[PDB]
Structure 1
């Protein structure tokens, strides 16, 4: 058989999901590389050539990729497909992007089942010669995602309802927090060049003090300094780096979509746990 069906995605979470559905019969490549900021990414000549060479382009939609529309004007005769059809959007409530959908829908495992379904449909339509391989790989991979729900829930189970505050830098965890009963606090609603972050840093400092929230987090594609400022001024621990916008590289700590969900939930649970330094009181 000749060269495989080539799929190009806008960022790495879609790439890894799509690659599991594709298995060995298609090659899935990501426009943005691990670690790169994906909201205001600036496409390069490599990105255009890679997209022009694909047989299918997958993107998130929900205004995640602010660059995609201009980028896509420069690609001729490549079909695109949004992978979030059927997602129920949560709105951004503050800032210059109030009213636009919060696009980080993949942070909910049960939304991943909708991503998988939409990717599977797109692949079967545009490469029907391998339809049965996509359908079987999509089914098998949905079962892996469904098996995550019960252990993720167990991992968070000793944080009582009123202590479940998720304090992060980007408000990128709203779909995860909704599924698992967390109240979200963020330093900015969504990545962008924007006013109001120093103000919000001080608003969040007050919320942590009033509710005795023990931990705050940052994310892997943005600067950890505002979160460290919050930790310094409140006494809350800096709980480390959460992954939402990007996987790591293939040899780093978060190589797959499932690992991103597990590491993020585990890092959250470790931030609330009492297993630090201990004395005999």
Structure 2
């Protein structure tokens, strides 16, 4: 097939988009993520090796919706490589309280129906910038979208033993708003979006309140942030610590969450197991 031939190179900001894009690209392009699995993605601090990586790319993809607060500054260091957001056509859910009230929640990929839009935007970008391989990108995008569509029934079935009134999803970052909307959960979080911020101790008390009044049985944390506030809530309440949920990062390839599909599956399975 050729060990020497330089393939079209895509660099993504973080691992979820890398894996979605690699499924669309197949063996016709190579996709690499800037952030490493487990690394916090909202306020990531790029290195000089990161600049070298993106400079080597033919196309740079990012979430937008101000997810990657570092990206626009990072992109100043890149010359003559185009960049594209992958969330065009996504309906934002706003953050509802605090100093980020009204800012778009950037975690749109946790809705599998939204992931179809991610796939379409990535397909368009790949076809635009590497048109010689359009048939491969289109074939692959269609087959991957069908895989994602086929998740809806098993995911809903996996959550089907939790009656509507009990469907409370208590997490650390409020990163699950789109998933909660899709599957009919009421979200509760310890902070509305990852950031250096005040007010988490106050919110811990508020969440203990909500847990106690609704007798919610489980609370979670996520793979790139601290599990201490979540475990503070579980200690003070009848709720068990059920975490860890995956949203901002895949695991390593040898870890429990190597792919975007595995991420959606593991997050849903862990929620269901909590109940």
Distance apart, 1:93 and its partner CA = 1.3
TM-score computed with the length of structure 2 as normaliser = 0.98
- CA distance in structure 2 between the aligned counterparts of 1:153 and 1:255, rounded to whole angstroms: 22
Structure 2: gaps (5+ residues):
none
Distance, in Å, in 2 between the alignment partners of 1:96 and 1:252 is 36
1:46-85 CA distances to partner (integer Å, 9 max, x unpaired)? 1101101100000000010000010011111111110000
What whole-Å deviation, never above 9, does each CA across 1:242-269 have from its counterpart, x for those lacking one? Answer: 0000000111000000000000000000
For 1:74-124, what per-residue CA distance to the aligned partner results, in whole angstroms no more than 9, with x for missing partners? 111111110000000000112222221000000000000000000000000
What does the per-residue CA deviation read over 1:190-246, in whole Å, with 9 as the maximum and x for residues that have no partner? 000100000000000000000000000000000100000000001200002000000
Mapped partners of 2:61, 2:108: distance in 1: 15
Residue 160 (structure 1) aligns with: 163
Contact 2:167 2:184 in 1 (8 A): yes
| 8 Å CA contact retained: 1:35, 1:220 | yes
What count of residue pairs does the alignment treat as equivalent? 272
TM-score, with length taken from structure 1: 0.96
Q: What secondary structure, in the 3-state scheme, does the structure 1 residue paired with 2:189 have? A: strand
Unaligned runs of 5+ in 1: 273-281
The answer as to whether partners of 2:224 and 2:248 remain within 8 angstroms in 1 is: yes
Structure 2 distance, partners of 1:69, 1:133, is 30
Confirm or deny that 1:89 pairs with 2:110. no
Separation in 2, partners of 1:46, 1:60: 21
- Whole-angstrom CA distance in 2 between matches of 1:11 and 1:228: 27
Is 1:222 the counterpart of 2:225 in the alignment?
yes
Say which SS state the counterpart of residue 186 (structure 1) adopts: strand
Distance 1:259 1:194 in 2: 31
How far the C-alpha of 1:26 sits from its partner, in A, is 0.4
**8 Å contact 1:155–1:269 — kept in the other structure?**
yes
For the Cα contact (< 8 Å) 1:96–1:194, is it kept in 2?
A: no
* 2-structure distance, mates of 1:95, 1:19: 37
| Structure 1 runs of 4+ with >4 Å offset | none
Structure 2 residue aligned with 1:110:
113
RMSD: 0.7
